[PDB]
Amino acid sequence: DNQFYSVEVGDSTFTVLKRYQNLKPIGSGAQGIVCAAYDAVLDRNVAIKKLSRPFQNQTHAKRAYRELVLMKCVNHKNIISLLNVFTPQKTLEEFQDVYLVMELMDANLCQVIQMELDHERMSYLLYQMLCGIKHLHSAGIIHRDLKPSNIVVKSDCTLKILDFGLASFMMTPYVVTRYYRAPEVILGMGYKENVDIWSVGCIMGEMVRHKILFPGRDYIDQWNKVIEQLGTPCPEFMKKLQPTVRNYVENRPKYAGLTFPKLFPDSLFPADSEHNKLKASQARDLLSKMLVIDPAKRISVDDALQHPYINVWYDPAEVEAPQLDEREHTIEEWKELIYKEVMN
Numbered sequence: 001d002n003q004f005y006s007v008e009v010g011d012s013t014f015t016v017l018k019r020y021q022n023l024k025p026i027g028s029g030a031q032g033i034v035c036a037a038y039d040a041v042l043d044r045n046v047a048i049k050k051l052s053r054p055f056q057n058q059t060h061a062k063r064a065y066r067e068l069v070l071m072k073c074v075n076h077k078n079i080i081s082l083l084n085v086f087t088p089q090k091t092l093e094e095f096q097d098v099y100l101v102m103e104l105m106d107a108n109l110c111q112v113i114q115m116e117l118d119h120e121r122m123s124y125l126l127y128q129m130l131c132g133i134k135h136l137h138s139a140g141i142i143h144r145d146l147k148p149s150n151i152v153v154k155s156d157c158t159l160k161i162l163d164f165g166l167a168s169f170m171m172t173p174y175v176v177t178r179y180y181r182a183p184e185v186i187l188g189m190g191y192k193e194n195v196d197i198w199s200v201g202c203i204m205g206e207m208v209r210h211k212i213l214f215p216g217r218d219y220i221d222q223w224n225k226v227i228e229q230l231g232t233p234c235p236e237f238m239k240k241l242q243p244t245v246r247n248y249v250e251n252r253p254k255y256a257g258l259t260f261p262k263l264f265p266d267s268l269f270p271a272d273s274e275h276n277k278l279k280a281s282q283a284r285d286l287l288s289k290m291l292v293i294d295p296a297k298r299i300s301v302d303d304a305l306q307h308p309y310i311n312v313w314y315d316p317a318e319v320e321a322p323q324l325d326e327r328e329h330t331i332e333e334w335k336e337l338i339y340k341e342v343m344n
């Protein structure tokens, strides 16, 4: 008379509470498998993610624990919130998997980037990313790794950021996507709240150009794509660099960089009406303020929410609302740390 039941999804097995029915695979990754399902108790559709032995290594462990803890430090409609969390295993000894449940979303941002969007939807999406990021910043959480695959949306244009960002080695078959990381993350320097504004601009630019702005096999290639388009950083920016890195970037070919009208031509923006012509100008303006290599001169979250392109959606109720853990542990220690959290 178990509260759970098991289902075969891929070469994987999902053991979930009986309230969740008609599971259907919708996504996978190096941290877990996601399924769509009907929650008969809430009479609502939901997404369920399985973390298989998240304590298996430090990488998986730190992330799972941080996110389990963080999800409690945040309360915002543009940030993921759990509906349920559970484990089919009855004791710590037997503990293996953690199931996370949230509201079923319709698509990720990669899909949205593939489409042509009016200014109303693009700015509304951007406005939401900003409200979420602002909320995280208010809770002392600087993300540093925002990316489209981790952002989901619904048909009504509503948006949720799914993870909490950065805090080593793993043997996963697939690498990490770094195309949206700021210069400061890429060059390992100090950083502030607006490190996330660079990521918002890589996304916004991609929604326009429909192509990853700064691709590359690694940080070497990536940095080359950054300077070839925006140009070599100002001399002062360099003084903020470690002598070694600084040597490397200071000794890199000096690029003039392109103007934003060239980087994002009018052809990419809908110029069939005065309204669309004005909005295109305002969008390019925001891009030029967000894609700024030197964090000292890059617009902040609050000022971006005040930019004309974004400001039309401003709402005090949405812009303002509002434990310590650090070190590393052994597998065993992590297993218990996560179990406790799961059992609350």
Ligand SMILES: CCCn1c(C2CCN(C)CC2)nc(-c2ccc(Cl)c(Cl)c2)c1-c1ccnc(NC2CC2)n1
Pocket: 026, 027, 028, 029, 030, 034, 047, 048, 049, 080, 082, 100, 101, 102, 103, 104, 105, 106, 107, 108, 149, 150, 152, 162
């Ligand atoms: C394609 C599915 C998108 N998605 C992802 C992915 C994030 C990036 N990695 C690499 C792969 C999985 N994680 C969750 C997710 C994250 C946290 C929790 Cl607690 C739960 Cl249940 C689900 C959801 C999602 C969530 C809701 N709706 C959807 N579906 C939209 C694409 C259909 N996906």
